Amino acid sequence: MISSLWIAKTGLDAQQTNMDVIANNLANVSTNGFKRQRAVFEDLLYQTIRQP
Amino acid sequence: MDHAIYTAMGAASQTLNQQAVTASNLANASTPGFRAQLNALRAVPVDGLSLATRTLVTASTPGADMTPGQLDYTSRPLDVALQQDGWLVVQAADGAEGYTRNGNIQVGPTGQLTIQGHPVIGEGGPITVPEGSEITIAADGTISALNPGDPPNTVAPVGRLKLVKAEGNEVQRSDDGLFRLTAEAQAERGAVLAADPSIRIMSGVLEGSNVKPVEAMTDMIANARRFEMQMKVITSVDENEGRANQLLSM
Amino acid sequence: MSGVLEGSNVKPVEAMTDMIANARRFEMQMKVITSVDENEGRANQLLSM
Amino acid sequence: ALLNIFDIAGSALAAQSKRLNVAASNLANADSVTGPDGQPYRAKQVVFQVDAAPGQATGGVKVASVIESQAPEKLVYEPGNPLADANGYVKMPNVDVVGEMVNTMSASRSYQANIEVLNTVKSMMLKTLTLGQ
Amino acid sequence: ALLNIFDIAGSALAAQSKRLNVAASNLANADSVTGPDGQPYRAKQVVFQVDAAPGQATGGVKVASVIESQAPEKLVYEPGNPLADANGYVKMPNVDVVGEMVNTMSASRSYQANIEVLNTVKSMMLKTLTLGQ
Amino acid sequence: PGGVPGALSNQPAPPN
Amino acid sequence: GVPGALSNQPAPPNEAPIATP
Amino acid sequence: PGGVPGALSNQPAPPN
Amino acid sequence: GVPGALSNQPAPPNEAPIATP
Amino acid sequence: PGGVPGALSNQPAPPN
């Protein structure tokens, strides 16, 4: 948590979640009536340190 | 002490701030419709008597990058992508009007269009679609709704998405990620941006993030080297003071 | 669900990041300890004469 | 109290020790998630000012108060945390690690300088007593 | 007032400190894109002269002024940058990082040397004070 | 007459 | 005056503006 | 008499 | 109670409780 | 009176 080891950890976790979604989609290819998943990401609150 | 340590220390801390901005940009490398933040160091010279020898450094985020990102083809009639220099209009968190590029338009059970949970702003206030109806979005933003069960002859327009034109120098990213007009730009263009009839959207394609990887890599390498440099000085000053304190002896 | 077995939920990214932060936090504590130890010597020498 | 320069340098030593203690406390708790009241650890800072009440401009150093920083606390997204707010954000300390390290080193250096000052003043006062044998 | 070698070594210490501060400023803002008025950060240097007083080319160093390097500023390509000229080129500082590191090391060692000179002269004159025991 | 002696007074800040 | 000397008036206040008006 | 000490006076320069 | 002074009454015992109560 | 000096006392402990 130096504010740069947390921000990059968050990105790593997001990419891992996306990979989990992709692996779930690929594993369920042979199932009947399966609707594929799609991962959506949004950036959290940006912090303002000093006004323009 | 010698306040030269307070210059290199500032240079080392602002480098960590720049790294925190760059890492935040890298985390959002897959966010749909994301605008990367620009980071730049700026030098402020301390004014006063005697040789103007001290010039501190402070990071700076001069707006964002407006270069359009990748267009992923998702065969979904609700996901739209905007022409370059274009923006979709949504209702912000505090009932205000904000701008975005995320075209992941969703339909609620009640029939209201939303983007990231914010209501979508149509030619006349938020857009409400007939409940549980198929939606097609035209090139100029017109919305056609097909009621299931009824024949395809029933397709009729319902509302038009508000599409605005704004450059990078006019918009500022608010704290919730939604862009809003800057003060100077708002004073000249009015409070609410009028819809531009020339803007063209594409249905079935979703715009990705414009985070350039090569610039990010180079920025992290340069930041690490600069931090190590400032750290050398922080060590030089320490030893110099340690020794200079001896003159106070005898 | 029968016929499947649930494993552990240890996240490797979190553990690796935490270990790096721990190491690079200790080093700083060791620096502060060394600084205080170096400081105390003078102060002790102040008691002479 | 402590004669004159004795009082001045002792006040300086005490103030710099307090500053170094604050810096060490900030460095130790840079990753603290909570306190006893459930509030995040806010970075502490001392306030240095002169103490020359009896009609002087220079009198040494004293710490007026310890104040918590107003720099925005760092928000981390964690919805499972009991301390998370309505949006799922947890507040974390605004400690500047490089700043606190530089504060530690600078406090040590000026503390040492004041030690050298007091020792020299003692020496001079010791020789004074041998004025004219 | 400062007497002889004390004056010389004090002037040398002050000028070496100024040189190191200028080097640290150059090395910190080696990547700054703009100043407060939109002009680029041009690298600064110190100018050394011999105190001399009027008739004595035997004095300490004195920093006559801080000059700004007139070497052409580096040009990078960025047509989207507001500070770019009509050709799309943004000016960037002409700082030589290796030169700044070497200058910092040199100011450091010279500072230490003059401290040692000052200490030796102080001890010499303190022992001179007891001439004839 | 004085303030925070360190990081919080040696960093540039917007005016009041 | 020259640096390190003695003057009859205080030095002017020290301020570092982030952005000039 | 003197000039810039250190970097700017210890590199090969064109005559001028 | 100025720090570094002399007071008739003893200092109260300090406490560092980990939780709130 | 007094207790264990050093590490054991200057470490947070459960209330008892």
XYZ file of C-alpha atoms in Angstrom:
707
model
C 0.000 0.000 0.000
C 2.391 2.749 -1.180
C -0.489 3.802 -3.485
C 1.421 2.239 -6.402
C 1.629 -1.332 -5.065
C -2.101 -1.105 -4.366
C -3.093 0.364 -7.739
C -1.142 -2.289 -9.658
C -2.458 -5.052 -7.381
C -5.979 -3.924 -8.263
C -5.147 -4.217 -11.971
C -3.628 -7.662 -11.485
C -6.788 -8.799 -9.691
C -8.965 -7.358 -12.465
C -6.990 -9.210 -15.144
C -7.196 -12.422 -13.111
C -10.976 -12.011 -12.858
C -11.183 -11.469 -16.619
C -9.109 -14.618 -17.174
C -11.455 -16.542 -14.871
C -14.431 -15.330 -16.922
C -12.686 -16.369 -20.151
C -11.837 -19.805 -18.746
C -15.445 -20.282 -17.633
C -16.655 -19.356 -21.125
C -14.211 -21.785 -22.750
C -14.962 -24.668 -20.375
C -18.723 -24.418 -21.013
C -18.514 -24.695 -24.807
C -20.231 -28.099 -25.015
C -23.105 -27.210 -22.668
C -26.626 -26.750 -24.036
C -28.169 -23.281 -23.959
C -25.149 -21.549 -22.426
C -24.875 -17.767 -22.688
C -21.323 -16.431 -22.746
C -20.113 -14.057 -20.041
C -18.395 -10.706 -20.625
C -16.424 -8.830 -17.970
C -16.995 -5.085 -17.540
C -14.566 -2.904 -15.584
C -14.859 0.643 -14.240
C -12.247 2.881 -12.641
C -12.929 3.839 -9.031
C -12.984 7.344 -7.503
C -10.020 9.425 -8.746
C -8.466 11.420 -5.841
C -7.800 15.175 -6.352
C -4.581 16.342 -4.595
C -4.575 19.987 -5.739
C -7.081 22.024 -7.756
C -6.161 23.500 -11.153
C 20.150 21.089 7.583
C 20.951 21.971 3.997
C 17.520 22.230 2.387
C 18.935 20.570 -0.727
C 17.613 17.362 0.843
C 14.128 18.909 0.766
C 14.468 19.339 -3.012
C 15.523 15.778 -3.832
C 12.929 14.488 -1.361
C 10.211 16.379 -3.210
C 11.528 15.035 -6.503
C 11.401 11.496 -5.089
C 7.862 11.866 -3.711
C 6.443 13.397 -6.891
C 8.011 10.490 -8.776
C 5.970 8.122 -6.605
C 2.900 10.234 -7.395
C 3.647 9.877 -11.116
C 4.093 6.131 -10.654
C 0.738 5.957 -8.863
C -0.889 7.743 -11.806
C 0.791 5.447 -14.347
C -0.158 2.310 -12.400
C -3.752 3.543 -12.222
C -3.700 3.989 -15.997
C -2.292 0.471 -16.435
C -4.945 -1.074 -14.169
C -7.657 0.316 -16.482
C -6.139 -1.150 -19.660
C -9.394 -3.084 -20.245
C -11.967 -0.561 -19.002
C -14.527 0.115 -21.772
C -14.312 3.729 -22.877
C -11.437 4.855 -20.660
C -9.389 8.030 -21.140
C -5.823 7.754 -19.857
C -4.542 10.476 -17.549
C -1.547 12.527 -18.685
C 1.225 13.093 -16.138
C 3.909 15.770 -16.320
C 6.459 17.229 -13.928
C 6.488 21.008 -13.534
C 9.261 23.098 -12.000
C 8.406 25.838 -9.500
C 11.289 28.176 -8.571
C 11.336 29.460 -4.994
C 11.409 33.261 -5.094
C 13.261 35.371 -2.551
C 16.631 36.969 -1.712
C 19.949 35.746 -3.029
C 21.029 33.302 -5.714
C 17.766 31.775 -7.048
C 19.297 28.338 -6.638
C 16.310 26.241 -5.473
C 13.698 25.003 -7.950
C 11.312 22.350 -6.657
C 9.302 19.920 -8.784
C 5.653 19.005 -8.487
C 3.711 16.521 -10.553
C 0.826 17.650 -12.710
C -2.001 16.068 -14.592
C -2.703 18.245 -17.674
C -6.086 16.812 -18.576
C -6.398 13.426 -20.269
C -5.630 11.752 -23.596
C -8.495 11.948 -26.097
C -7.041 9.627 -28.744
C -9.717 7.015 -29.551
C -8.993 3.477 -28.408
C -9.561 0.051 -29.877
C -12.965 -0.940 -31.272
C -13.971 -4.470 -30.275
C -16.725 -5.982 -32.423
C -19.364 -7.387 -30.070
C -22.455 -8.421 -32.013
C -24.747 -6.566 -29.603
C -27.129 -3.854 -30.874
C -26.870 -1.841 -27.638
C -23.074 -1.417 -27.457
C -22.245 1.691 -29.492
C -18.992 3.487 -30.246
C -18.628 7.190 -30.971
C -16.830 9.017 -33.744
C -13.529 10.649 -32.683
C -13.990 13.942 -30.714
C -17.516 12.756 -29.789
C -19.144 12.163 -26.403
C -22.273 10.517 -25.042
C -24.250 12.449 -22.429
C -25.488 10.855 -19.202
C -26.957 12.184 -15.955
C -24.183 12.422 -13.355
C -24.360 11.196 -9.770
C -25.548 14.552 -8.389
C -28.336 15.018 -10.925
C -26.003 16.940 -13.251
C -24.997 16.348 -16.866
C -21.786 14.474 -17.628
C -19.962 13.132 -20.680
C -18.589 9.672 -21.374
C -17.350 7.316 -24.075
C -18.571 3.996 -22.645
C -21.259 2.752 -25.008
C -22.261 -0.250 -22.890
C -25.915 0.791 -22.795
C -28.086 -1.404 -20.569
C -31.871 -1.721 -20.328
C -33.496 -2.075 -16.927
C -36.660 -4.012 -16.093
C -38.604 -0.734 -16.058
C -37.194 0.132 -19.492
C -34.782 2.984 -18.729
C -31.449 3.175 -20.543
C -28.359 3.317 -18.335
C -24.582 3.569 -18.715
C -22.510 2.338 -15.744
C -25.656 2.860 -13.669
C -26.098 6.482 -14.784
C -29.245 7.313 -16.796
C -28.689 8.007 -20.494
C -29.710 11.522 -21.609
C -31.896 11.617 -24.732
C -32.928 14.576 -26.877
C -35.351 15.419 -24.009
C -34.203 14.172 -20.599
C -33.482 10.522 -19.738
C -34.565 7.863 -22.273
C -37.297 5.399 -21.306
C -37.741 2.433 -23.655
C -40.911 0.291 -23.822
C -40.509 -2.530 -21.328
C -38.781 -5.654 -22.609
C -38.373 -4.509 -26.218
C -35.572 -5.046 -28.717
C -33.518 -1.894 -29.317
C -31.625 -0.853 -32.446
C -29.499 2.312 -32.512
C -29.007 4.141 -35.810
C -25.859 5.873 -37.061
C -27.064 9.305 -35.890
C -28.403 8.061 -32.546
C -32.044 7.360 -33.415
C -33.497 4.507 -31.349
C -35.901 1.960 -32.829
C -37.881 -0.303 -30.498
C -39.454 -3.611 -31.533
C -42.077 -5.025 -29.185
C -41.770 -8.835 -28.989
C -44.734 -10.728 -30.415
C -45.693 -7.931 -32.786
C -44.449 -8.176 -36.394
C -41.244 -6.415 -37.503
C -43.435 -3.820 -39.252
C -44.022 -2.274 -35.801
C -40.441 -0.911 -35.548
C -40.748 2.823 -34.858
C -38.356 5.473 -33.522
C -38.585 6.331 -29.824
C -35.780 8.733 -28.916
C -32.454 10.104 -30.074
C -29.245 9.863 -28.060
C -27.593 13.192 -27.267
C -24.171 13.268 -28.944
C -21.869 16.217 -28.266
C -18.521 17.384 -29.647
C -15.773 18.432 -27.237
C -11.987 18.564 -27.494
C -9.475 17.676 -24.798
C -8.772 21.288 -23.837
C -12.440 21.889 -22.950
C -13.278 18.934 -20.679
C -12.042 17.961 -17.218
C -12.405 14.574 -15.542
C -14.521 14.887 -12.408
C -13.810 12.802 -9.319
C -16.238 10.051 -10.402
C -14.617 9.564 -13.820
C -17.233 11.532 -15.777
C -15.954 14.410 -17.893
C -17.482 17.870 -17.495
C -16.931 21.207 -19.195
C -14.162 23.387 -17.795
C -14.925 26.882 -16.516
C -13.531 28.844 -19.471
C -15.088 26.404 -21.949
C -18.438 26.439 -20.128
C -18.521 30.246 -20.082
C -18.237 30.341 -23.880
C -20.226 27.238 -24.879
C -22.989 27.624 -22.292
C -23.966 25.378 -19.415
C -25.327 22.477 -21.507
C -23.676 21.366 -24.739
C -25.989 21.381 -27.740
C -26.149 18.147 -29.707
C -24.021 18.158 -32.853
C -25.940 16.734 -35.848
C -22.671 15.716 -37.548
C -21.601 13.181 -34.877
C -21.799 9.532 -36.071
C -22.002 6.478 -33.745
C -21.434 2.796 -34.715
C -23.723 0.085 -33.303
C -22.263 -3.280 -32.357
C -18.746 -2.069 -31.501
C -17.417 -1.138 -28.058
C -14.524 1.277 -27.562
C -11.696 0.122 -25.310
C -9.119 2.035 -23.301
C -6.436 4.140 -24.989
C -3.668 3.290 -22.502
C -0.535 3.136 -24.638
C 1.742 0.355 -23.321
C 5.086 1.576 -24.694
C 4.686 5.017 -23.121
C 3.709 3.408 -19.816
C 6.761 1.112 -19.837
C 9.133 3.976 -20.702
C 7.550 6.133 -17.989
C 8.069 3.466 -15.314
C 11.707 2.949 -16.348
C 12.383 6.696 -16.263
C 10.587 7.086 -12.924
C 12.664 4.340 -11.312
C 15.907 5.892 -12.558
C 14.895 9.383 -11.394
C 13.936 8.078 -7.946
C 17.314 6.369 -7.585
C 19.078 9.577 -8.656
C 17.243 11.746 -6.136
C 18.056 9.073 -3.522
C 21.797 9.462 -4.274
C 21.580 13.220 -3.504
C 19.501 12.490 -0.357
C 22.507 10.385 0.745
C 25.155 12.939 -0.294
C 23.479 15.742 1.735
C 23.116 13.432 4.783
C 26.869 12.576 4.951
C 27.895 16.193 4.191
C 25.784 17.484 7.126
C 27.023 14.673 9.395
C 30.586 15.897 8.760
C 29.808 19.653 8.749
C 28.356 19.331 12.251
C 31.922 18.778 13.509
C 32.840 22.440 13.033
C 30.450 23.146 15.947
C 32.898 21.128 18.131
C 35.755 22.779 20.109
C -22.618 -30.700 -5.850
C -21.345 -34.285 -5.728
C -18.272 -35.401 -7.636
C -16.194 -32.223 -7.294
C -13.796 -31.120 -4.560
C -13.212 -27.567 -3.352
C -9.603 -26.444 -3.011
C -8.015 -23.505 -1.232
C -8.746 -19.839 -1.923
C -5.240 -18.434 -1.387
C -4.572 -15.670 -3.913
C -0.958 -15.695 -5.176
C -0.891 -12.072 -6.364
C -2.028 -10.790 -2.969
C 0.518 -12.941 -1.127
C 3.421 -11.911 -3.376
C 2.555 -8.211 -3.137
C 2.194 -8.500 0.642
C 5.583 -10.210 0.958
C 7.279 -7.500 -1.116
C 5.646 -4.778 0.986
C 6.669 -6.565 4.190
C 10.318 -6.835 3.169
C 10.473 -3.173 1.986
C 8.731 -2.060 5.197
C 11.107 -3.950 7.521
C 14.161 -2.404 5.799
C 12.805 1.043 6.698
C 12.252 0.028 10.320
C 15.868 -1.233 10.438
C 17.043 2.120 9.068
C 15.168 4.039 11.777
C 16.568 1.735 14.477
C 20.105 2.337 13.196
C 19.515 6.100 13.114
C 18.320 6.191 16.736
C 21.216 3.997 17.881
C 23.700 6.309 16.154
C 21.988 9.351 17.687
C 22.158 8.036 21.258
C 25.964 7.802 21.251
C 26.576 11.522 21.001
C 23.919 12.289 23.556
C 25.712 9.848 25.874
C 29.038 11.591 25.207
C 27.371 14.860 26.274
C 27.603 13.651 29.900
C 31.404 14.034 30.024
C 33.093 16.776 32.068
C 16.174 26.511 34.458
C 18.987 25.420 32.066
C 21.044 28.665 32.253
C 20.732 30.097 28.692
C 22.289 28.241 25.743
C 21.648 25.174 27.903
C 17.905 25.857 27.835
C 17.964 26.758 24.131
C 19.792 23.610 23.033
C 17.817 21.374 25.393
C 14.576 22.715 23.942
C 15.937 22.054 20.455
C 16.934 18.494 21.397
C 13.517 17.740 22.888
C 11.707 19.184 19.870
C 13.798 17.239 17.360
C 13.321 14.048 19.378
C 9.561 14.639 19.225
C 9.761 15.208 15.465
C 11.758 12.002 14.963
C 9.256 10.112 17.133
C 6.398 11.405 14.977
C 8.268 10.368 11.825
C 8.933 6.882 13.215
C 5.279 6.496 14.227
C 4.199 7.524 10.723
C 6.655 5.091 9.119
C 5.529 2.206 11.341
C 1.802 2.743 10.684
C 1.972 3.384 6.929
C -0.193 0.297 6.260
C -2.568 0.441 9.237
C -6.179 -0.165 8.248
C -7.837 0.934 11.498
C -7.407 2.274 14.998
C -9.144 1.495 18.293
C -12.092 3.729 17.337
C -12.316 2.267 13.831
C -10.865 5.446 12.295
C -7.922 5.337 9.871
C -4.489 6.388 11.074
C -3.892 9.984 9.986
C -0.294 11.103 9.539
C 0.885 13.197 12.484
C 3.079 16.290 12.270
C 4.667 18.501 14.909
C 4.467 22.301 14.918
C 7.761 24.088 15.601
C 7.891 27.657 16.857
C 10.191 29.904 18.854
C 9.821 30.585 22.588
C 11.161 34.069 23.380
C 8.446 35.414 25.671
C 10.595 37.741 27.864
C 11.020 40.425 25.217
C 13.273 38.614 22.745
C 13.189 37.530 19.116
C 15.261 34.345 19.549
C 14.690 31.828 22.320
C 14.985 28.325 20.891
C 12.370 25.852 19.702
C 9.205 24.366 21.187
C 6.504 22.092 19.796
C 3.187 23.935 19.990
C 1.010 20.946 19.076
C 0.746 17.696 17.131
C -1.679 17.928 14.207
C -3.126 15.366 11.810
C -2.580 15.985 8.082
C -5.506 17.185 5.929
C -4.136 15.658 2.687
C -6.950 13.442 1.253
C -6.733 9.898 2.761
C -6.084 7.086 0.262
C -9.261 5.293 -0.817
C -8.913 1.595 -1.641
C -11.777 -0.442 -3.065
C -12.744 -3.289 -0.739
C -16.453 -4.157 -0.392
C -16.000 -7.055 2.033
C -14.240 -4.889 4.616
C -16.424 -4.015 7.639
C -14.931 -0.497 7.582
C -15.929 0.129 3.954
C -18.333 2.998 3.312
C -21.500 2.908 1.197
C -19.489 2.826 -2.045
C -17.212 0.085 -0.697
C -14.175 2.320 -0.169
C -11.795 2.004 2.787
C -9.701 4.945 3.968
C -5.954 4.386 4.386
C -3.204 6.631 5.778
C -1.829 9.543 3.759
C 1.735 8.865 4.935
C 4.489 9.957 2.542
C 7.167 7.301 2.987
C 10.012 9.232 1.346
C 9.016 12.329 3.294
C 9.145 10.478 6.604
C 12.513 8.892 5.786
C 13.981 12.299 4.929
C 12.418 13.677 8.117
C 14.116 10.941 10.151
C 17.523 11.658 8.624
C 17.204 15.450 8.909
C 15.979 15.244 12.508
C 18.945 13.038 13.389
C 21.383 15.462 11.746
C 20.047 18.580 13.468
C 19.796 16.700 16.781
C 23.492 15.858 16.408
C 24.303 19.485 15.590
C 22.567 20.632 18.778
C 24.479 17.971 20.734
C 27.716 19.445 19.378
C 26.526 22.962 20.315
C 25.689 21.996 23.925
C 28.995 20.088 24.350
C 30.991 23.105 23.065
C 29.065 25.534 25.342
C 29.854 23.257 28.325
C 33.565 23.239 27.349
C 33.626 27.052 27.134
C 31.837 27.407 30.474
C 34.279 24.930 32.006
C 37.253 27.000 30.841
C 35.636 30.221 32.038
C 35.853 29.078 35.675
C 39.667 29.146 35.369
C 39.684 32.891 34.631
C 42.948 34.203 36.053
C 43.865 30.842 37.613
C 33.717 39.246 11.972
C 35.000 35.985 10.398
C 38.831 36.130 10.454
C 41.085 34.829 7.615
C 40.914 31.073 7.004
C 37.549 31.064 8.783
C 36.235 33.519 6.181
C 37.878 31.567 3.340
C 36.511 28.174 4.372
C 33.078 29.613 5.158
C 32.868 31.130 1.686
C 33.987 27.823 0.180
C 31.368 25.874 2.164
C 28.601 28.276 1.155
C 29.536 28.139 -2.528
C 29.842 24.345 -2.559
C 26.413 24.149 -0.920
C 25.035 26.436 -3.640
C 26.633 24.264 -6.317
C 25.093 21.124 -4.828
C 21.677 22.796 -4.566
C 21.838 23.823 -8.229
C 22.878 20.286 -9.186
C 19.996 18.817 -7.170
C 17.544 21.224 -8.811
C 18.820 20.275 -12.269
C 18.648 16.556 -11.487
C 15.173 16.736 -9.924
C 13.529 18.600 -12.829
C 15.418 16.792 -15.602
C 12.020 15.727 -16.999
C 9.854 18.789 -16.304
C 7.895 19.851 -19.378
C 6.837 23.370 -18.361
C 7.580 26.105 -15.881
C 5.014 28.336 -14.180
C 4.821 30.745 -17.144
C 4.861 28.084 -19.871
C 8.577 28.343 -20.614
C 10.739 25.205 -20.414
C 13.015 24.511 -17.475
C 16.497 25.435 -18.684
C 19.380 23.914 -16.749
C 21.010 26.241 -14.223
C 24.684 26.480 -13.295
C 26.723 28.465 -10.795
C 29.543 30.882 -11.617
C 32.598 30.767 -9.353
C 34.927 33.718 -8.766
C 37.775 34.501 -6.388
C 36.674 36.743 -3.493
C 39.924 38.701 -3.919
C 38.628 41.768 -2.172
C 40.604 44.372 -4.238
C 44.313 43.326 -4.212
C 44.681 39.658 -3.215
C 44.034 36.923 -5.840
C 44.135 34.775 -2.710
C 40.583 34.452 -1.288
C 37.737 31.990 -1.122
C 35.148 31.247 -3.762
C 32.065 33.383 -4.239
C 29.091 32.575 -6.517
C 28.781 35.642 -8.741
C 25.413 34.588 -10.178
C 23.353 31.606 -11.296
C 23.435 31.397 -15.076
C 20.936 29.577 -17.280
C 22.354 27.232 -19.906
C 21.904 28.682 -23.394
C 22.536 25.332 -25.068
C 19.591 24.504 -27.355
C 16.793 22.756 -25.492
C 15.992 19.176 -26.507
C 13.062 18.865 -28.908
C 10.465 16.104 -28.674
C 7.529 15.511 -30.999
C 4.069 16.109 -29.536
C 1.553 17.926 -31.775
C -1.174 17.516 -29.153
C 0.809 19.327 -26.471
C -0.417 22.928 -26.005
C 3.195 24.083 -25.566
C 4.280 22.740 -28.966
C 5.422 25.317 -31.510
C 4.099 25.647 -35.067
C 6.133 22.564 -36.052
C 4.789 20.394 -33.223
C 8.007 20.279 -31.176
C 7.998 20.597 -27.383
C 11.100 21.889 -25.617
C 12.599 19.680 -22.894
C 15.486 20.367 -20.497
C 19.095 19.897 -21.610
C 20.178 18.300 -18.321
C 23.065 15.810 -18.471
C 22.243 13.391 -15.653
C 25.758 11.931 -15.428
C 27.183 15.443 -15.244
C 24.787 16.335 -12.433
C 25.688 13.194 -10.468
C 29.406 13.895 -10.863
C 28.854 17.530 -9.861
C 26.966 16.453 -6.734
C 29.785 14.086 -5.776
C 32.377 16.800 -6.418
C 30.555 19.443 -4.378
C 30.224 16.848 -1.612
C 33.936 15.973 -1.419
C 35.038 19.613 -1.708
C 32.586 20.544 1.060
C 34.078 17.817 3.257
C 37.633 18.944 2.477
C 36.915 22.543 3.437
C 35.228 21.343 6.634
C 38.425 19.470 7.499
C 40.518 22.564 6.727
C 38.303 24.682 8.983
C 38.519 22.156 11.824
C 42.313 21.953 11.572
C 42.698 25.739 11.595
C 40.321 26.032 14.554
C 42.369 23.504 16.530
C 45.603 25.247 15.522
C 44.439 28.635 16.779
C 42.906 27.140 19.928
C 46.352 25.716 20.697
C 47.902 29.062 19.723
C 45.796 30.627 22.482
C 47.968 28.794 25.062
C 51.305 30.146 23.812
C 53.786 30.098 26.668
C 51.395 27.814 28.583
C 5.093 32.532 13.143
C 5.578 28.862 12.310
C 4.032 25.694 11.011
C 4.632 22.049 10.213
C 8.458 21.633 10.078
C 9.048 19.292 7.164
C 7.179 17.637 4.298
C 3.879 19.471 4.779
C 5.444 22.937 4.427
C 8.091 22.280 1.742
C 5.698 21.075 -0.982
C 3.943 23.385 -3.469
C 0.279 24.030 -2.721
C -2.537 26.001 -4.350
C -3.212 29.396 -2.769
C -5.837 30.290 -0.189
C 23.592 42.932 0.307
C 26.021 40.072 -0.297
C 24.910 36.652 1.009
C 25.855 35.965 4.611
C 26.162 39.655 5.518
C 23.974 41.748 7.843
C 21.126 43.959 6.627
C 18.857 46.537 8.248
C 15.570 45.134 6.886
C 13.985 41.664 6.758
C 14.187 39.512 3.665
C 10.971 39.442 1.609
C 8.507 36.578 2.129
C 9.348 33.326 0.356
C 6.621 31.883 -1.870
C 6.607 29.282 -4.648
C 3.587 29.552 -6.975
C 2.493 26.352 -8.680
C 0.962 28.303 -11.580
C 1.514 31.992 -12.251
C -1.646 34.179 -12.435
C 38.062 35.747 -14.842
C 36.462 32.431 -13.915
C 33.399 30.747 -15.334
C 30.898 27.940 -14.795
C 32.458 25.393 -12.404
C 32.182 21.693 -13.154
C 30.058 20.355 -15.993
C 29.876 23.192 -18.525
C 33.626 23.951 -18.439
C 34.963 20.367 -18.562
C 33.674 19.207 -21.942
C 35.070 19.702 -25.459
C 33.380 22.725 -27.001
C 33.523 24.342 -30.450
C 35.799 27.396 -30.664
C 34.065 30.705 -29.958
C 0.933 22.180 32.405
C 3.947 23.319 30.394
C 6.158 20.379 29.335
C 9.521 20.335 31.072
C 8.213 22.178 34.141
C 7.693 21.010 37.730
C 4.250 20.215 39.136
C 3.205 19.183 42.632
C 0.778 16.449 41.434
C 2.119 13.260 39.814
C 1.506 12.555 36.154
C -1.543 10.372 35.436
C -0.814 6.779 34.355
C -0.792 6.406 30.584
C -2.734 3.641 28.843
C -2.720 2.161 25.329
C -5.915 0.149 24.786
C -5.898 -1.825 21.504
C -9.694 -1.813 20.874
C -12.055 1.068 21.823
C -13.324 0.138 25.364
C 6.738 -0.991 41.230
C 8.156 -2.287 37.956
C 7.984 -5.097 35.452
C 9.891 -6.728 32.593
C 12.019 -4.037 30.896
C 12.348 -3.607 27.166
C 10.626 -5.676 24.504
C 7.849 -7.315 26.523
C 6.441 -4.164 28.143
C 6.616 -1.889 25.080
C 4.463 -4.234 23.003
C 0.656 -4.083 22.834
C -1.015 -6.758 24.944
C -4.592 -7.956 25.475
C -6.316 -6.126 28.342
C -6.192 -8.008 31.639
